[PDB]
Design a protein around this ligand. Sequence first.
Ligand code: F3S
Ligand code: F3S
Lengths: 66, 66
Amino acid sequence: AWKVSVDQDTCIGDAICASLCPDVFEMNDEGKAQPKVEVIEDEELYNCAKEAMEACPVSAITIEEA
Amino acid sequence: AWKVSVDQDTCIGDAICASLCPDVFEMNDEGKAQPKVEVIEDEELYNCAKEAMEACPVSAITIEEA
Ligand code: F3S
Ligand code: F3S
């Protein structure tokens, strides 16, 4: 399983992650992204998370495997 | 790039990780594993880190992608 993280101190609210993967990322009341789900096992969702991580212009997103 | 982590509270010093991947894991003075390197970009090393993560009998190891 994978767990996504959005560094709130890095994120500038570009939102391309939420664009690419709205099932995994949502905007919060500070205009930053955060994960909508606390675990991913679905391969398709994992793949769009990785796409979002690769696209963030400020490198705010990380993904952990266990 | 990837970063390994070994939860010191979880690890019981089984050491199969160090067996499978001695370039990535070493034993420390408390009898627990820890990462020898702070970053992996080599695919071979990543692969044997993932093998070690899948083999740990107590699930002490995790790997983060950025
Ligand atoms: S700036 Fe923030 S809103 Fe998404 S694309 Fe990067 S984590
Ligand atoms: S118990 Fe510890 S020594 Fe390695 S195989 Fe698991 S992290």
